[PDB]
Ligand binder design. Structure first.
Ligand SMILES: Cc1cc2nc3c(=O)[nH]c(=O)nc-3n(C[C@H](O)[C@H](O)[C@H](O)COP(=O)(O)OP(=O)(O)OC[C@H]3O[C@@H](n4cnc5c(N)ncnc54)[C@H](O)[C@@H]3O)c2cc1C
Ligand SMILES: Cc1cc2nc3c(=O)[nH]c(=O)nc-3n(C[C@H](O)[C@H](O)[C@H](O)COP(=O)(O)OP(=O)(O)OC[C@H]3O[C@@H](n4cnc5c(N)ncnc54)[C@H](O)[C@@H]3O)c2cc1C
Lengths: 401, 401
């Protein structure tokens, strides 16, 4: 069932959350974690937020207190594993035996093929090292180009503008946040960033670059001192692929975290898993999944009577003045707008319904509403639609009832 | 590894191929097959072909000779399985114990929601019973409407025209055979069927029906004596889903046929698996996959040193005068056309290349070319493109060299 010793590959949030839950649940056997970064395990969301602004890494470290008696092999890369011999080969020449193996290796930013042989600074933003390297080029009045209009690029955009950096952003699609965000939210977010001086370019792609200038597919040019590419990430599933596990930009797992290989599990950004709301498999790229899936898989390993992972997806994003929170699906057959959608003191809530059932919710500067909406979302509530729009209605009431 | 006893759910081609390989490979333990159809196991491709024309079911039975000492529970449905207790519950009230469970339950035709409460004959074509029921309504000069332009619908269309039946066909897309067929092939196939009197309607959908007439989304009508729906199939993965296996319109499996659940495997139409040419997961809906995956998974269960499933995909279709064969991918960056594409004695070959490498091939009334092209495809050959077009070139030569 849960066979000792436990080895976890990756030392990010999913891994930390998993090994802490193992200990809290009562497992007292060996746990060894292999982490390729030579860094005290740390959280990523600050990297495009407060960290990029203030630069104190000792404010972003994960709490490994609830994970006593774990050996963390930092700065070491797992190079392969042999699922028959039950061993992992490490880059330092050592080998770890395992009873249970857990792949928590995350994902890495996609490169932009058109900028491959570029001769100007081109970075991505995933690691503490990336953030330090980017932060060191945020010279006031310098020009930054961001490729991709996902939340991390937008968080960087807002951080950069706040630092006095001129920001341009190129987005292949007609809208920002094309992944898991209601169109109404995306349109509003574009209006916000535009108003803050971000030069937004929709429906354009990068074709290449020459001497410090980026080329676009409309035949035009954008000069920049630095490009940050943020067009999404790819699962770090190479070990799983080589060992014969079912993978496709992500290791396939069930609700117990099981891969297709006996005694090998996977969690976090590296997994492709069932979204309970859509009923489809997808790679979920959020902080809450990394933590919550790690916890669920550990809990069930120690107590096989515990249910499989069942949490519904949600995330947040801090983009200057906008505190954004998004849960569930981006769309259904109906959207209910609570409040006015306005650049003047932005504060609104969106609710997505499918045949009367809540399937998604968004809060912008409205954190008190988010928690009740997530509970209503969780039980598939079908509240009165007039009430939901009715600003008099208090949402915490409904959830309680 | 391979633990006795073996239980297989489903008694179609994948199942028959698997249990035959188990015996041929040397496994002598118990094998029990559960099949919900009360029929001697039979092959499906004849159902839209020679069978629909001649009606002799004793010409379409599968050969279970290479599978001695198998108990076939025909006319029995597996209702659930318990992967911890290692048992399967049957619809006749019995329970089967298993060491190794194999899900080979295939797929079923999708229903058309717009025709749900229709009051006219609406059938799909998957089973021997379906074919008999459809064949009994192919009255000469009757009017048949087919929904969907996939190969089975087109095979039925050609069979029906040959029987003197007036045939209309409604296709949501701009082209027939939208799944895994080169556009050049699809365009030609439309010209053939049109020339044979099939009334083709592209870019239309069915909105409903009233008193023997089908309604379309262009606001028009088609009267018919019978509708056959052929808009694709859905994996029969309900048992796997209920038991906690990773599924998404298909049970996820690696190259060994392993699901995410220890001691449970899956094969054939029910699986979602890696396509080696695209490197993506897909549900492969072909005769050759059912046979070849069944054989590979069995072989590796008996001999763990054997490689995992590795065959590249291919299928054929018989549509009146057209003997169509298709291997690999529908497209690449280049297509080479061997011969003329003409309704006058149709006979041509298509070759799809990606950066000089063969990734796909089509033969129409040109079976001698198909086998060499599949071998060239298998080794990722990069032959001379001028030679490939050069009709002088004999293809069997190249493959040999
Ligand atoms: C800049 C940024 C901002 C974000 N903001 C938010 C946010 O506001 N809200 C939100 O919901 N989410 C946010 N996220 C997303 C979030 O942080 C991720 O979902 C989360 O980090 C995933 O955790 P993980 O443990 O699964 O993967 P990871 O954090 O990527 O950890 C995996 C670790 O394993 C390492 N590894 C990989 N391969 C090997 C190997 N062979 N051997 C050893 N180690 C290996 C990796 O290098 C990595 O260190 C943000 C992410 C980034 C990068
Ligand atoms: C009309 C038609 C024409 C075709 N023509 C071609 C062709 O020319 N070329 C080609 O490449 N392919 C063709 N195919 C495709 C091909 O035949 C399939 O790919 C193949 O049948 C798949 O085999 P299978 O064993 O995986 O699934 P199946 O043949 O569907 O067998 C599965 C069996 O398991 C049964 N079952 C399901 N659930 C349970 C349960 N809970 N308990 C017990 N039994 C269960 C099913 O009813 C079914 O009998 C055709 C298919 C059809 C229907």
């Amino acid at each position: 069932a849960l066979k000792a010793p436990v080895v976890v590959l990756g030392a990010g949030l999913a891994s930390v959350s998993f090994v802490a839950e193992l200990r809290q649940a009562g497992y007292q056997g060996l746990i060894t974690v292999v982490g390729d970064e030579a860094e005290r395990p740390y959280d990523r969301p600050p990297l495009s937020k407060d960290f990029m602004a203030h630069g104190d890494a000792e404010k972003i470290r994960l709490d490994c207190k609830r994970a006593p008696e774990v050996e963390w092999l930092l700065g070491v890369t797992a190079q392969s594993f042999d699922p028959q011999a039950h061993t992992v080969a490490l880059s330092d020449g050592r080998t770890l035996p395992y009873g249970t193996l857990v792949l928590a290796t995350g994902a890495a930013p996609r490169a932009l093929p058109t900028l491959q042989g570029a001769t100007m600074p081109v970075h991505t933003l995933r690691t503490l090292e990336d953030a330090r390297r980017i932060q060191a080029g945020l010279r006031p009045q310098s020009r930054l180009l961001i490729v991709g209009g996902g939340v991390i690029g937008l968080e960087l955009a807002a951080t950069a503008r706040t630092a006095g950096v001129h920001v341009s952003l190129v987005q292949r699609g007609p809208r920002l946040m094309s992944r898991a965000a209601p169109a109404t939210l995306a349109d509003f977010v574009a209006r916000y960033h535009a108003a803050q001086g971000v030069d937004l370019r929709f429906e354009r792609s990068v074709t290449g670059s020459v001497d410090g200038v980026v080329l676009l597919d409309d035949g035009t040019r954008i000069a920049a001192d630095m490009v940050v590419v943020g067009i999404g990430v790819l699962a770090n599933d190479a070990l799983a692929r080589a060992a014969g596990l079912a993978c496709d930009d992500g290791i396939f797992v069930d609700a117990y975290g099981r891969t297709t290989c006996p005694d090998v599990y996977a969690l976090g950004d590296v997994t492709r898993q069932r979204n309970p709301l859509s009923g489809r498999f997808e790679r979920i790229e959020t902080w809450s999944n990394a933590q919550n899936q790690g916890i669920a898989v550990a809990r069930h390993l120690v107590d096989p009577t515990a249910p499989g992972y069942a949490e519904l997806p949600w995330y947040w994003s801090d983009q200057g003045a906008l505190r954004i929170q998004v849960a569930g699906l981006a769309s259904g057959d109906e959207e209910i707008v609570r409040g006015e959608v306005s650049l003047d003191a932005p504060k609104f809530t969106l609710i997505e319904l499918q045949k009367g059932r809540i399937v998604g919710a968004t809060c912008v500067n409205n954190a008190r509403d988010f928690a009740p909406l997530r509970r209503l979302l969780a039980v598939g509530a079908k509240p009165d639609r007039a009430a939901l729009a009715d600003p008099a209605t208090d949402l915490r009431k409904l959830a309680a009832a």
